[PDB]
Design a protein around this nucleic acid. Structure first.
Ligand SMILES: [Mg+2]
Ligand SMILES: [Mg+2]
Lengths: 171, 159, 185, 58, 51, 222
RNA sequence: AAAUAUGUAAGAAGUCCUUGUUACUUAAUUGAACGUGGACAUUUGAAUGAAGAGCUUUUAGUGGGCCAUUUUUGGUAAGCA
RNA sequence: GAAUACUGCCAGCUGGGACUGAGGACUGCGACGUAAGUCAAGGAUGCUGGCAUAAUGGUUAUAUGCCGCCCGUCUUGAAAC
């Protein structure tokens, strides 16, 4: 859906042999708290020997964007499962916030590789603080000095089923 | 043709075990059974007399008769759409006491002790067992336990 | 749709409003359904259910059973109640001075009871003497003594009286009944 | 003209229609199969117990 | 003969619950909370803003 | 023997003390509800201020709604649904959260939607669809006399007393819950929100544990 | 050496104390079984639900089946067995 | 130092629309009232117009929209070429 980012902090259940476990923390892009906690336990079952019955979640907090009106370039490292194997990819997206960047990332992977939400693993997402570290041409195109371009062929959708003049596509 | 003998399909069921073959130890002969005891049935392949059938392996029953070297046990067998009563004469090498019964009797005597001691005060004894309740509120601190951030690991061959 | 856990629309299976067309019996069940509705005594409900019963569920009660019930201690002056018929018994020789309320009395039983000094009472006179069943004692005859229940549940190793017309030697005493001829049941 | 040999289809449904009633247990179960030397003494023990109780509450 | 529904029908609402009248009087549905000036710890906010 | 004035006046007076007891009880319940929720909020704030984390208590109550119809159900989940009294689609029941009941909810996960109900949705359920089981009959509540006649042995006098016993899962929760007839809800007024129901709520469907989003669904279906 | 299935138990027909019977048993009032009298009651012994629970008689039709998911046998396979 | 978004609550107010009016003296729970009493409180009443007849309605033929395979039988399966 429209994604939100949460921090989820959890731990193992405390025993007498070891009280105070190590309080692992992860950042999850998810639609809500339930999906966020499910993905948290999914990745902790991939990492450490723990499961939901043997552990607990001590905190979940929404992390909204610090500057939601700054235009950033993000580099995203992704695992995905194809029909024959597992691959790593690095894609970079020029967008205004992290949740919108990963939303366009999920759309981009589903469009160009037919990869689903169950197949995509988000390794990391990070803002590229400096230009000329941008490595893709499709985003390096929009970083030029005095960028301007026209929008040819305007199509205006009509409300009536009949129009009384030939329309114009000037913009 | 088909074959359904008395000990058909009993190969691994009536093997002895690994490294405990041979003669049986004397605790099985020194154990004492009374009428009304609840016993588990597990056949010993080293003793061929007084053997139970393969249906009653792992079955639990009640003693109704005590003879010289054997024990009469009552099992309930599902036949069709009802249970029937089955009486078995088994030598004592093929039975042992059920531990759940003695655990329950220990609960009975400790429970009566609790009721007897708390009857002198009337403090709402609350003698029934309760299952696993949901765990209540707690405060977890980060003093020396600052959270460590984890991320998914990229893919590798590992061969 | 409902996931039904029981059979829908089933009758209760208990007989009410008896199948007989006897008008005096219908008057009696009218009186006792009034009494069972409003006197809040269990005796009236018991005799109301006993009034519905069929003939084999109303076995006769002998005067010997009545006398044996009266020989219970603290029960010498109770009123014996038989929802059904009362037959006599020549196997008993002395009879106490009781009161017996019943549907029907045979001639011998009525003669025995009124000869011993007691009395025979109908159920409506029982109702007007004891509306809540004061000092009563309900007796029932033996249901499992009929000839038909001998053959009920016949099978191997049951000892349960085969349905047979002629008896004696050579009428079912052979192969299947002694081990010299085959097997024994 | 071959036919179906054997199946257990529908059998558990047929059983669980009005099925799997546990047998009725009673106080004082049957003493058949119990050892005759035990029963022969048990008869005399209960006879003496009944005589003692009758003499106590006579 | 007919089920009149509370959460409309204030007559049967007052029939079931007498406290609803003083609830509406005191306006406990919109109750103003008392403000507290507590600030979270620096370790909490840096753990929150940690990448 | 006029018998229409003195007994009527005594009955009216007795109703007046019953009404006064119900009024002060509801005042106490409202006070303890708001102090409890404000104490939880302040405990979270103090844990954040001290640099710790406040792990709140696991919820002791769920509301369970049957979502799948009655055809083609395996026998073990079918028996669990009958034991939880969900014999109809869009039928709901409160369940006390215990390990023994969590295993049942795990068994009938693909046919129910359950979650943690709030005070508002509990109040709306009992007030709108409130039916008691009185000698195997489904009686609408509609008056406190019914509730104090049937649950007055176990201290419950009014509908808000029954609501309090439900939400604070007390000593007589089992008796109050079995007195309550299963709630017959309708289909949701705004729809289910998903194109396809019988996936898990995590998978974008409807069954499973929408742990706190059950209030929106139940308020739409009620 | 799992998972899923599977046996039993979660009391009143129970526990504890005392002492009666016997031709059984013991070196022996030693034990075995059944008992007398006395004490322990609504949290009487986990959860949930109960729609009534239990019992009996009599008789109909049926005794060619087939399909789907999962496990699986023969077969290259089959809308095959 | 604020606002707003998002989510949640109100026993907050209020506008439009549709379907239903079962029951038939009274009894109950309530509310507003000092009281008399009143009320939206255990199921619809008040006011008004037209017509009083084939007008509504029923039946029947036709037209239109959508749907509708031939019955009985054997069979796992029948509209069956
Ligand atoms: Mg399906
Ligand atoms: Mg859909």
């Amino acid at each position: 859906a429209h994604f939100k980012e949460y921090q989820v902090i959890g731990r193992r259940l405390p025993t007498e042999s070891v009280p105070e476990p190590k309080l692992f923390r992860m950042r999850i892009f998810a639609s809500n708290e339930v999906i966020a906690k499910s993905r948290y336990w999914y990745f902790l079952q991939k990492l450490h020997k723990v499961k939901k019955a043997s552990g607990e979640i001590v905190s979940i907090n929404q992390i909204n964007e610090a500057h939601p009106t700054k235009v950033k370039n993000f580099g995203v490292w992704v695992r995905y499962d194809s029909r024959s194997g597992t691959h790593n990819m690095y894609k970079e997206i020029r967008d205004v916030s992290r949740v919108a960047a990963v939303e366009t990332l999920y759309q981009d992977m589903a469009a160009r590789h037919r990869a689903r939400f169950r197949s995509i693993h988000i390794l990391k997402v990070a803002e590229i603080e400096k230009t000329a570290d941008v490595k893709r041409q499709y985003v390096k195109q929009f970083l030029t000095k005095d960028l301007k371009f026209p929008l040819p062929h305007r199509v205006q959708k009509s409300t009536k089923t009949f129009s009384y003049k030939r329309p114009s596509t000037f913009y | 043709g088909k074959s359904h003998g008395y000990r058909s399909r009993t190969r691994y069921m009536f093997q002895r075990d690994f490294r405990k073959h041979g003669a049986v130890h004397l605790s099985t002969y020194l154990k004492v059974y009374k009428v009304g005891d609840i016993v588990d049935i597990k056949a010993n392949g080293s003793i061929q007399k007084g053997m139970p059938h393969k249906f009653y392996q792992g079955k639990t029953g009640v003693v109704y008769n005590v003879t010289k070297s054997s024990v009469g046990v009552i099992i309930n067998k599902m036949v069709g759409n009802r249970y029937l009563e089955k009486r078995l004469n088994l030598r004592v090498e093929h039975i042992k006491h059920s531990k759940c019964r003695q655990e329950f009797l220990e609960r009975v005597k400790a429970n009566a002790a609790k009721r007897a001691e708390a009857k002198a005060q009337g403090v709402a004894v609350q003698l029934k067992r309760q299952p696993a309740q949901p765990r209540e509120s707690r405060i977890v601190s980060t003093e020396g336990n600052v959270p460590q951030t984890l991320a998914p690991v990229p893919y590798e061959t590992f061969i | 749709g409902i996931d039904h856990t029981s059979k829908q629309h089933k009758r209760s299976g208990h007989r009410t409003a008896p199948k007989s067309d006897n008008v005096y019996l219908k008057l009696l069940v009218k009186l006792y359904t009034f009494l069972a509705r409003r006197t809040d005594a269990p005796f009236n409900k018991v005799v109301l259910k006993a009034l519905f019963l069929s003939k084999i569920n109303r076995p006769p009660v002998s005067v010997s059973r009545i006398a044996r019930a009266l020989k219970q201690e603290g029960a010498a002056n109770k009123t014996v109640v038989v929802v059904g018929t009362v037959t006599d018994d020549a196997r008993i020789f002395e009879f106490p001075k009781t009161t017996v309320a019943a549907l029907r009395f045979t001639a011998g039983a009525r003669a025995k009871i009124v000869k011993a000094g007691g009395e025979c009472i109908t159920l409506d006179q029982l109702a007007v003497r004891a509306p809540k069943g004061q000092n009563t004692l309900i007796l029932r005859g033996p249901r499992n003594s009929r000839e038909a229940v001998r053959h009920f549940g016949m099978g191997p190793h049951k000892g349960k009286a085969p349905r047979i017309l002629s008896t004696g030697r050579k009428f079912e005493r052979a192969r299947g009944r002694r081990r010299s001829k085959g097997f024994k049941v | 003209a071959k036919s179906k040999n054997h199946t257990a289809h529908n059998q558990t449904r047929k059983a669980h229609r009005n099925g799997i009633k546990k047998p009725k247990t009673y106080k004082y179960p049957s003493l058949k199969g119990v050892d005759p030397k035990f029963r022969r003494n048990h008869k005399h023990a209960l006879h003496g117990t009944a005589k003692a109780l009758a003499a106590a509450k006579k | 003969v007919l089920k009149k529904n509370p959460l409309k029908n204030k007559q049967v609402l007052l029939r079931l619950n007498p406290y609803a009248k003083v609830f509406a009087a005191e306006k406990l549905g919109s109750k103003k909370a008392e403000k507290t000036g507590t600030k979270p710890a620096a370790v909490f906010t840096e753990t929150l803003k940690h990448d | 023997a006029e018998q229409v004035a003195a007994e009527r006046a005594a009955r009216k007076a007795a109703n007046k003390e019953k009404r006064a007891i119900i009024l002060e009880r509801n005042a106490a319940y409202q006070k303890e509800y708001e102090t409890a929720e404000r104490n939880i909020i302040q405990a979270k704030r103090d844990a954040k201020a001290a640099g710790s984390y406040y792990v709140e208590a696991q919820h002791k109550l769920v509301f369970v709604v049957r979502i799948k119809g009655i055809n083609k159900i395996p026998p073990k989940p079918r028996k669990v649904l009958q034991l939880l009294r969900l014999t109809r689609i869009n039928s709901g029941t409160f369940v006390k959260v215990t390990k023994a009941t969590l295993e049942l909810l795990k068994l009938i996960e693909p046919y129910v939607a359950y979650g943690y109900p709030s005070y508002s949705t509990i109040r709306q359920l009992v007030y709108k669809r409130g039916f008691g089981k009185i000698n195997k009959q489904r009686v609408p509540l509609s008056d406190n006399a019914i509730i104090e006649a049937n649950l007055g042995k176990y201290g419950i006098l009014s509908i808000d007393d029954l609501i309090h016993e439900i939400i604070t899962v007390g000593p007589h929760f089992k008796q109050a819950n079995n007195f309550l007839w299963p709630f017959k809800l309708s289909n949701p007024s705004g729809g289910w929100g998903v194109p396809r129901k019988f996936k898990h709520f995590i998978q974008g469907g409807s069954f499973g544990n929408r742990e706190e989003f059950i209030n929106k669904l139940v308020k739409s279906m009620n």
